[PDB]
Amino acid sequence: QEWKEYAKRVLDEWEPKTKLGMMVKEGQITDIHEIFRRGYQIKEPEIIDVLLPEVNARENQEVLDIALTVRMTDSGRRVRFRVLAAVGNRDGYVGLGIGHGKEVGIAIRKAINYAKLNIIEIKRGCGSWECRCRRPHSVPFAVEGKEGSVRVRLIPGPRGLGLVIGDVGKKILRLAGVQDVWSQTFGETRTTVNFAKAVFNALYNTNRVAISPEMIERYGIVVGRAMP
RNA sequence: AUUCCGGUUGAUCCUGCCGGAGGCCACUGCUAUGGGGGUCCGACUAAGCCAUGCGAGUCAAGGGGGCGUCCCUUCUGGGACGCC
Ligand SMILES: [Zn+2]
Known about the structure:
The PDB classes it as ribosome. The protein has helices spanning 2-13, 19-26, 45-51, 104-118, 167-176, 192-204, 213-219, and strands at residues 62-73, 76-89, 93-101, 120-121, 123-124, 143-147, 150-156, 163-164, 181-186, 222-223. By secondary structure, the protein is α+β, with helices and mostly antiparallel strands. Zinc ion is lined by residues 126, 128, 131, 133, 135, 137, 158-159.
């Protein structure tokens, strides 16, 4: 309910700037599932804040990396902060963002804003040989994701088995909603940005695999939010 | 738990190895209140060398004898009873 009044207040205070913003403010769009899979552009965070207001919860916002960066000038060293952050709701919507600033706080606000703009939609299910239930507690099937030199393979796992994946990967998966998965990684996983983006791509690729209608019943495939 | 993290740069991304983090076995510093179960305790170097004690005996219903007790007939000798 609190997030519902937050959405109401931001809707009252918000003036549209883009076509999608005007559409949402008018009311043609009322569910977050209606902004994806249409080719629209999301350049205004108010849409996310209104349709999926729970992403603003501190428990639902996570910062994955803070990196000091330096560039040389004849007058010395100019120092910048790069903050990699992840946001989303624990029901099938997640997003990852990178923000640059002169201070950690500025970088954090920019990164969270970009993550909100970059939010995506994923599909969950169960496809593990040892589990064979119909609940959306894991990834429906094995998926791949590559960024830089980091390759991440996510495999379904039985219920009760936690996230067998690096810390940042399990943080991203927890934000997305997944809670049981096995991992297989190659490359330099110590590069936090590349690893997080690889996990993001692996989660995103769940929509790039053709499935017959029977597979939905077999694996309990749920797109975006579930029975909630 | 089908996992990672630290380290080449003014800063970035790679390859590559080194180190942390787990289990098991052998020595070892500090320390120690109990009870049960087990197939643990001079294998790693010397299958090197050994004081002393013990670790393979049993059969009297296979045989002839010696010792001692008794019942004795009675110099003879018969029979039981054990021990050597
Ligand atoms: Zn399952």
